[PDB]
Write a protein that binds this ligand. Structure first.
Ligand code: ADP
Lengths: 137, 608, 194, 196
DNA sequence: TTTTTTTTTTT
């Protein structure tokens, strides 16, 4: 997998398999949940109206939040790649920044909130700190 | 959205004696404002058959006739076209005989008649309708007789014959027997020079895709163009035909099935989409001649700054892309030679430097631009490929991409994921300007005078800033000479630039004139400046200084070889820089604007 | 049956004060061109030039208007322009007066308090559109019984839906008397909660 | 422009055209009184400032603010008045006493308006005739016959007959009573007129 | 509007 087809996305989750015996109790539960054989039927008809009625953009403060988050995300990748340069890595790019913005939009669309704020930018940034460190590992 | 008028109503500002004597009174038109007596004369000065009428006027003039005309279209249009010849004889009887019969189109706003081929039921039989939709085939234009002129070599007389078929407004099936002995005594002989034929086509409108209920195969309808309406529609358009609806019966062997075939005898055609921008206002041309005179120093730079505001940095690249959007001057000598007048740009650099963005903008700005990739494009699918037909089964030459885009732009992104056997198919169509094909049963030469804008990711994934510019690009020194401008969009990790870049993109995510560059370049394209000996001795020197390695520098590598082919790219960039000024004579300030671009695009610096 | 909302006076000289229909009616936007500067308030659109094209609610442009056009002048939307005034004369039974709305006769009768030149030609469009669309509301409302009428009513405005709901309430009330059904005493407003 | 908060009080009552009393909105009402006060002071400042330096060019900025409060007045009396219609109905349809699924949605001062209206109405009613007037609340439909056959639908402690002869009301048990008494209960939801 | 054989362009 090239560092470029990989970079065509924005969020990487290395899914993990748990084989714990309490996890195996969860599995024993799920066994009969199939052996026997907020709802989607309204979730879909909710989305159908949410997507088509909200026009969210960013507020002035989210801008200076993201600028100072992204600049300091860049500012260390230099000393990261200038020494180790292990023939492959993943640095930040403006496409990923635009991905962050369009994620915050979708968060603040859950609430029909026509103006997003710091209410979700940091948690989205931490979600991304997970999603980029996954591909880092 | 409902099209209840051919003129888009939102932004238009920015017995049979009564009918014939009412149409004439309507066509007088003198005493109120003289709207049509200003059009009959207008067409007589252009030698036209038919005139377009607005039924919206017929309403205000006489409602009863306007309603009787939209529901009995045949008996009313045979009386309209009579009381129109009558009214043209009332101006110039000499003209009123040059043409056999006049015609009369229609346009305006019909109430419920604005139908689609899906709604065109059988309650619209013999009723003016206004069908919208896409043309999806055409027929072969063929004559069709409407009168013969015979002659008797024995009796020295001259007999005639009037013809009529089921595709008229009167509909009597005459036989095309071409009488040879009217009376058994004398023999006849036809005279083709004095007879009268007309044209005849048959197209097939089909419902618009985004208007179908998507469950079926969208419905169709058959149109019968005629009498110089003929070639007014090619496959793939969006037309608004305005024609009578008709059913034409038949009988094979004295026994008719009740089933009939219904056609639309068109009497006007309208392309819905406006596909050009020549309709500049006199106020607009005034603005243009102002702006072209205000400052001749800074109009090129001022033009290029406003090119793609959605992008930060890359001033040089915008400058060169503007030069592309203008173009040079194609000189063709007297003996028959030819020298190209286009500029081909190549952009290489690390990912996410807005390359694809520049391409997608140049696509929409210039008219007649074609997009293409580096894997969804074969070496033959770009220029021309041989195939056959399904109806005839004989070979022909389907035009590739770079032949459709003639006098246009071709945007090739990821030009590096294209195999070696595929680039080579371009070396003829990028310089000589025309494609030559000698396949099995095909020997042709197509005109493909176009210009190439290409984007390529460097080898090693990222531009190793230490190797050399020649090892970071895979292209061989034969293809690297065609593209006359090579821009290495190097990405740098200094903390400052990222700050303003983020500022800019985020401002863009919180939302010279844009629609003025269109007119300005569509106007300044035609100008054809001419060199002058003050600069022609400066270029002939900057080149001979470029060609000498010593004068270049040390610790400086060459991106592409300097040949006698960059010499006439200097000349092209120059006479494309004196096209923004609308100058018409290149001066020493031009031949110096276009030398620094080269000095910057040719030589790169290597680090260690 | 006893909740008598305040009706709409949007067709006469001036809208009523407490009518919730006119309140939402006048809120609709309208284009204006300003005649002076707009000091201390250029934040919305600090000062605004003179000769600027702006979009303002109708209620705002009621007091900001004078005969001399002191503060600003007005120009009608295209729905009332000369363009559409011929469309509505071709055949008025075809237009979607809900998209071109949803207050056509209500708005158009308040654009006569701006003493424009073409008033003698707007008050003739309305009259000749309402008369045109009448025999299709008199007959599709007194003759649509136990049907899904949500498609006979998809192209109407608030001045016409109020009549399509009065045709039905008189059809469904004679058809309930003919069938000996309007004798039983029933719960009036509690079946609305149920 | 302005008035985007008041127009969230109205665009809610306009969604309930049946006459069903929604929950009072103290929040938005306070939120619009605040904007009234804000614009009031921020305009009065420049009003008296246009007499203390001659800034008459601010005259527009008065109207744009003078009228832009009248709006916020209209859209807060209409709402406060409309909701006083959907309340009086609950005296001609339900009756003199309401269940607390209703008396829980009225703001605590509308109950005083109610208990005033109800009392004045009961005052007027008893004034018509000599003996305790004529209760015009009942009698909503022309009388058809003299006795009616009802059928209970919920439990109800012990309905009364004028002569002290009570009647228990279990579920699904039908009587034959004079329609002179059953009208109050049929129109609420307790009984039901079966033999139409 | 089907098989089968033979040549040449194309993915
Ligand atoms: N200098 C820049 N100015 C404006 N936008 C930029 C810039 N650099 C990157 N971007 C944004 O980042 C994304 C980069 O994608 P792009 O550069 O098209 O990828 P590629 O370079 O692989 O074609 C685009 O969405 C673009 O809007």
């Amino acid at each position: 997998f090239m560092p470029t087809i990989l970079s065509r996305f924005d969020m990487i989750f290395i899914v993990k398999d748990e084989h714990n015996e309490e996890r195996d109790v969860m599995l024993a539960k799920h066994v009969i949940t199939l052996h026997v054989s907020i709802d989607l039927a309204k979730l879909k008809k909710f989305i159908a109206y949410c997507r088509v009625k909200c026009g969210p953009r960013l507020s002035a403060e989210a801008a200076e939040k993201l600028k100072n988050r992204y600049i300091i995300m860049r500012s260390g990748a230099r000393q990261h790649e200038r020494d180790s340069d292990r023939r492959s890595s993943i640095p930040i790019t403006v496409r990923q920044l635009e991905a962050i913005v369009r994620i915050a939009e979708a968060l603040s669309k859950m609430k029909l909130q026509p103006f997003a704020t710091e209410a979700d930018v940091e948690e989205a940034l931490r979600l991304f700190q997970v999603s980029t460190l996954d591909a880092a590992l | 959205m409902l099209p209840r008028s051919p003129p888009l109503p939102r932004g238009n500002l920015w017995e049979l004696r009564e009918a014939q004597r009412d149409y004439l009174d309507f066509l007088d038109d003198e005493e109120d404002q003289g709207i049509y007596q200003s059009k009959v004369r207008e067409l007589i000065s252009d030698n036209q058959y038919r005139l377009i009428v607005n039924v919206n006027d017929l309403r205000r003039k006489n409602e009863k006739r306007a309603n009787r005309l939209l529901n009995n279209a045949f008996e009313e249009l045979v009386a309209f076209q009579r009381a129109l010849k009558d009214f043209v004889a009332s101006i110039d009887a000499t003209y009123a005989k040059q043409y056999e019969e006049f015609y009369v189109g229609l346009e305006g706003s019909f109430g419920s008649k604005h139908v689609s081929p899906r709604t065109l039921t059988s309650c619209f039989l013999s009723c003016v309708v206004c069908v919208e939709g896409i043309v999806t085939k055409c027929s072969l234009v063929r004559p069709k007789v409407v009168r013969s002129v015979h002659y008797c070599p024995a009796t020295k007389k001259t007999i005639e014959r009037r013809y009529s078929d089921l595709t008229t407004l009167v509909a009597f099936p005459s036989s095309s027997v071409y009488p040879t002995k009217d009376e058994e005594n004398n023999p006849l002989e036809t005279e083709y020079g004095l007879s009268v034929y007309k044209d005849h086509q048959t197209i097939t409108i089909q419902e618009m895709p985004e208007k179908a209920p998507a469950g079926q195969l969208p419905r169709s309808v058959d149109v019968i163009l005629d009498d110089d309406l003929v070639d007014k529609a090619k496959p793939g358009d969006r037309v608004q035909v305005v024609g009578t609806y008709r059913c034409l019966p038949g009988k094979k062997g004295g026994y008719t099935s009740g089933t009939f075939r219904t056609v639309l005898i068109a009497c006007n055609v309208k392309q819905m989409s406006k596909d050009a921008q020549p309709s500049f206002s006199a106020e607009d041309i005034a603005k243009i001649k102002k702006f072209s005179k205000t400052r001749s120093k800074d109009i090129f730079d001022q033009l290029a700054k406003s090119l793609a505001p959605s992008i930060h940095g890359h001033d040089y690249v915008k400058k060169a892309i503007l030069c592309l959007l203008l173009g040079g001057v194609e000189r063709d000598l007297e003996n028959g030679s030819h020298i190209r007048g286009d500029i081909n740009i190549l952009l290489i650099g690390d990912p996410s430097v807005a390359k694809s963005q520049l391409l997608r903008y140049v696509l929409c700005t210039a008219p007649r631009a074609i997009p293409t990739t580096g894997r969804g494009s074969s070496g033959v699918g770009l220029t021309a490929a041989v195939t056959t037909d399904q109806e005839t089964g004989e070979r022909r030459l389907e035009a590739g991409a770079m032949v459709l885009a003639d006098r246009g732009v071709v945007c090739i992104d990821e030009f590096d994921k294209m195999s070696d056997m595929d680039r080579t198919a371009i070396h003829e169509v990028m310089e000589q300007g025309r494609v030559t094909i000698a396949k099995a049963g095909i020997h042709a030469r197509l005109n493909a005078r176009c210009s190439v804008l290409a984007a390529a990711n460097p080898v090693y994934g990222r531009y190793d800033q230490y190797k050399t510019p020649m090892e970071n690009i895979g292209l061989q020194d034969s293809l690297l000479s065609r593209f006359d401008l090579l821009f290495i969009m190097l990405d740098q990790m200094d903390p400052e630039q990222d700050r303003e870049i983020s500022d800019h993109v985020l401002r863009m995510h919180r939302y010279v004139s844009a629609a003025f560059m269109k007119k300005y370049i569509h106007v300044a394209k035609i100008i054809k400046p001419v060199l002058t000996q003050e600069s022609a001795t400066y270029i002939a020197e900057e080149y001979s200084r470029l060609r000498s390695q010593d004068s270049m520098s040390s610790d400086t590598a060459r991106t592409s070889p300097v040949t006698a082919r960059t010499l006439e790219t200097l000349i092209r960039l120059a006479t494309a820089h004196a096209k923004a000024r609308m100058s018409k004579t290149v001066d020493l300030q031009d031949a110096e604007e276009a030398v620094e671009l080269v000095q910057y695009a040719y030589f790169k610096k290597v680090l260690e | 049956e006893a909740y008598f909302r305040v009706e709409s006076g949007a067709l006469g000289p001036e809208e009523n004060f407490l009518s919730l229909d006119d309140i939402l009616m006048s809120h609709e936007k309208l284009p204006v061109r300003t005649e002076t500067a707009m000091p201390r308030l250029g934040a919305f659109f600090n000062a605004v030039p003179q000769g600027s094209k702006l979009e303002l609610p109708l209620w705002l442009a009621k007091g900001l208007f004078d005969n001399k056009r002191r503060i600003l002048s007005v120009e009608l939307p295209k729905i009332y322009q000369e363009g559409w005034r011929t469309v509505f004369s071709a055949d008025p039974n075809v237009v979607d007066l809900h998209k071109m709305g949803p207050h056509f006769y209500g708005f158009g009768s308040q654009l006569l308090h701006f003493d424009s030149p073409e008033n003698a030609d707007i008050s003739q469009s309305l009259l000749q559109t309402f008369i045109g669309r009448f025999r299709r509301i008199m007959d599709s409302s007194q003759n649509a019984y136990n049907e899904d009428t949500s498609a006979l009513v998809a192209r109407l405005d608030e001045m016409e839906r109020g009549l399509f709901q009065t045709g039905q309430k008189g059809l469904n009330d004679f058809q309930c008397w003919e069938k000996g059904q309007a004798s039983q005493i029933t719960a009036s407003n509690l079946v609305q909660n149920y | 422009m302005f008035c985007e908060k008041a127009m969230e009080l109205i665009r809610e009552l306009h969604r309930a055209p049946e006459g069903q009393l929604p929950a009072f909105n103290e929040d938005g009402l306070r939120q619009v009184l605040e904007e009234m006060k804000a614009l009031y002071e921020q305009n009065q400042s420049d009003v008296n400032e246009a007499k203390s330096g001659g800034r008459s060019d601010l005259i527009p900025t008065i109207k744009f603010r003078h009228c832009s409060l009248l709006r916020n007045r209209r859209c807060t009396v209409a709402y406060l008045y409309d909701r006083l219609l959907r309340i009086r109905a609950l005296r001609w349809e339900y009756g003199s006493v309401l269940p607390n699924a209703l008396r829980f949605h009225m703001a605590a001062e509308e109950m005083e308006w109610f208990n005033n209206y109800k009392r004045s109405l009961a005052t007027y009613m008893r004034s018509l005739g000599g003996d305790e007037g004529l209760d015009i609340t009942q009698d909503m439909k022309p009388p058809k016959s003299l006795y009616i056959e009802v059928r209970c639908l919920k439990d109800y402690g012990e309905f009364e007959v004028d002569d002290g002869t009570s009647v228990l009301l279990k579920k699904n048990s039908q009587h034959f009573l004079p329609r002179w008494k059953c009208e109050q209960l049929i129109r609420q939801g307790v009984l039901e007129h079966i033999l139409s």
